[PDB]
């Protein structure tokens, strides 16, 4: 996780600045997601945790926490913390905690931001406690069960020595237990309702156990796909994070896309048919063609797998990737479109005219999957507000 | 290709701030790898034009310029304009070039940071003199030709209609030609010797047609394969990267690693034989386990490819990562461990006492070359300076 914009560095975001490419960010759809969520819960169902590490998903966590503020959500879950520092400066002054264990470097240099950690080790635990001591504070802490089988965060309970552990990290000075958490491993209801199971009776051992106040834990399990689909794993939080920008569960049409993948082309060049395209020669040229230069490659976060079938979008067409990716440049061949020039914006993810590069698309390539690429495309190039771009809009 | 830091922000580097997981970047090494490249070009060989794109591969072009300042490099060669923007602000004042064909917003808006551009039609050269003539300016070009036949940036002279568009190039108002340029897409001798031969007749038909004056001209081809293996193709001037950064032809050990991927240790936590990891359960554990939590995923640039093999250096021993990689945690089975425990240090790439974390070992797991990652590792991770002086001697 790198450094984030300082408070005072507001260039992201910004559509005039040049960018040899750049994501789309789609607000009123982040926007929209949260409501529809908020509908389906209903004003009486679990408070919402919106899940925003790796900056947001890749749509940056600078640009969304303002809608998440104005929404009221009163959770957001992190995993850096650089994603913290932001979310406190972007006016956030809900709950704050991290999804994942953090090192004691991380944990001692986050008190600024008055998160909460996430414990599933004794060691761990008295590490933390050690730290809130020499600090004279308190850090409270949620208590990772690995009730649902993840075996990542959470300490597990069939253990008779981690028993004694979980008790033991509920007495430790400096540290208060605000919580009780597991995570689902498979996205399939079946294994979800027998993770559920178990954290039931893991929860209620802890609580019994360790003589912990309900009134005073945060109970919560589901991420999205058990939060859309196995609402009895609701209790008292939820931890959404692909339903909020549009990647969950495909058939739930009503969370949209909140991101898009664009670039430009910077040259467009004439080669003779027999000549071939891109390091190592991989790709002959049956004709003579014009192939657009765009100005991105595997450094940029795009088509890191190098000779990986892939498609652009210019005038609202699919053209093809042609050669190898480079570290800074990838070729498509244009030959069949007439007045392609330098400048003309080209679609790596998302819509043009009637086409559309989609998920489904880019995942039909065996091991992709859309978070990893998007999440790298977030951290490797500029991100521009859709809605401030308005050549195309229609009030006056 | 994102933001860089501004040039009052000194985060970038420092060794006491928190990090999930870092770069260290050995600037001993880097100037080594310099004068190394010097000694073996000779006081009457070329030119080095140091070649810094994605934020200098990946180590931080804000970090690393300042040694090519104080080594009197006289040229040097990126691909964004931030890149371009960092390199002024750190003291750089040689030849500052494009590597790659640019957008028309690029070039624009890249005239305050006195930079070179690379042009390989007439469409883009237009465009680019058309901007120089409305800021009353002028922009250097080096004239990118496709004699070794790359198809990416270059003009194709076998082409009789590109042939008359290059000499057009050559009289646009507010560009001057100041260099004559091709790249090698095959890291062979003899591929190299065909490709320079070419060049050689085409960069000698421009000068003629073209009745451009040789001294104003420098005449450039060859990366770091061909500036170690092909000495025929010196010319002017050379433009090594990976040779630079100690990734090149391995055989070649006097070129030193200038950086090392590296994490921490966040808990250790005990689970039962029969459990699985990750999401998916795609790993069992076969045994009562101790699993090291590192707090990196994908999202900081690690492999999520399943792998079998894949592992990690702790304690100076090789132990195996296990489950699928989560996008900001992966799990290393340190069962056969004694006493590991939060804050331990851990080698994703580099030397740890007498073990190592091998380049082809990660590329195959990978299955692309150590580039596609470590350029990811660097824009997704901080970055902390190490010196090894030296190197050097003193004695006062
Ligand atoms: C990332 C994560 C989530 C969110 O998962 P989604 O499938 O994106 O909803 C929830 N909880 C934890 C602990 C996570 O790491
Ligand atoms: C990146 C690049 C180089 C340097 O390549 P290395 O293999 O890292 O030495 C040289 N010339 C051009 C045009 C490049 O794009
Ligand atoms: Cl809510
Ligand atoms: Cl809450
Ligand atoms: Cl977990
Ligand atoms: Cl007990
Ligand atoms: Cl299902
Ligand atoms: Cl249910
Ligand atoms: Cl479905
Ligand atoms: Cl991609
Ligand atoms: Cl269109
Ligand atoms: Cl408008
Ligand atoms: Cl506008
Ligand atoms: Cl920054
Ligand atoms: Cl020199
Ligand atoms: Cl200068
Ligand atoms: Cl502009
Ligand atoms: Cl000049
Ligand atoms: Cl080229
Ligand atoms: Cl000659
Ligand atoms: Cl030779
Ligand atoms: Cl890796
Ligand atoms: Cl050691
Ligand atoms: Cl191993
Ligand atoms: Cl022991
Ligand atoms: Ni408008």
């Excluded at 679990?46 to 809608?67: N, Q, T």
């Amino acid at each position: 996780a790198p450094y984030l914009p300082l408070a005072s560095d507001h260039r992201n975001g910004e559509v005039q600045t040049a960018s040899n490419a750049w994501l789309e960010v789609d607000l009123g759809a982040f926007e929209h997601n949260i409501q529809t969520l908020k509908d389906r819960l209903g004003d009486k169902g679990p408070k919402i945790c919106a899940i925003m590490k790796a900056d947001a998903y890749g749509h940056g966590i600078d640009l969304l926490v303002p809608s998440v503020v104005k929404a009221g959500i009163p959770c957001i879950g992190i995993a850096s913390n650089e994603e913290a520092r932001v979310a406190r400066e972007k006016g956030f002054t809900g709950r704050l905690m991290r999804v994942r264990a953090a090192t004691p470097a991380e944990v001692e240099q986050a008190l600024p931001y008055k998160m909460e950690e996430l414990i599933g080790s004794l060691v761990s635990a008295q590490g933390i406690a050690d730290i809130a001591q020499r600090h004279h504070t308190n850090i409270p802490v949620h208590i990772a069960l690995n009730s649902a089988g993840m075996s990542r965060n959470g300490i597990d309970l069939r253990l008779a020595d981690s028993k004694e552990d979980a008790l033991a990290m509920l007495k430790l000075k400096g540290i208060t237990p605000v919580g009780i958490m597991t995570h689902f491993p498979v996205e399939e209801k079946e294994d979800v309702k027998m993770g559920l199971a178990q954290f039931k009776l893991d929860s209620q051992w802890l609580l019994e156990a360790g003589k912990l106040d309900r009134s005073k834990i945060t109970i919560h399990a589901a991420n999205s796909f058990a939060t859309l689909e196995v609402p009895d794993a609701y209790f008292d939080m939820v931890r959404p994070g692909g339903l909020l920008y549009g990647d969950s569960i495909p058939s739930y049409t009503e969370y949209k896309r909140v991101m898009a993948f664009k670039t430009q082309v910077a040259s467009v060049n004439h080669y003779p048919a027999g000549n071939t395209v891109g390091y190592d020669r991989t790709f002959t040229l049956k004709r003579d063609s014009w192939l657009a230069n765009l100005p991105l490659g595997y450094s940029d976060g795009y088509r890191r797998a190098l000779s990986n079938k892939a498609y652009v979008l210019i005038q609202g067409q699919k053209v093809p990737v042609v050669g190898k990716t480079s570290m800074n440049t990838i070729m498509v061949d244009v030959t069949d479109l007439k007045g392609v020039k330098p400048g003309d914006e080209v679609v790596l993810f998302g819509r043009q005219g009637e086409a559309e590069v989609k998920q489904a698309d880019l995942e039909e390539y065996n091991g992709a999957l859309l978070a990893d690429m998007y999440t790298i495309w977030g951290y490797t190039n500029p991100k521009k507000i859709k809605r401030s771009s308005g050549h195309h809009h229609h009030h006056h």
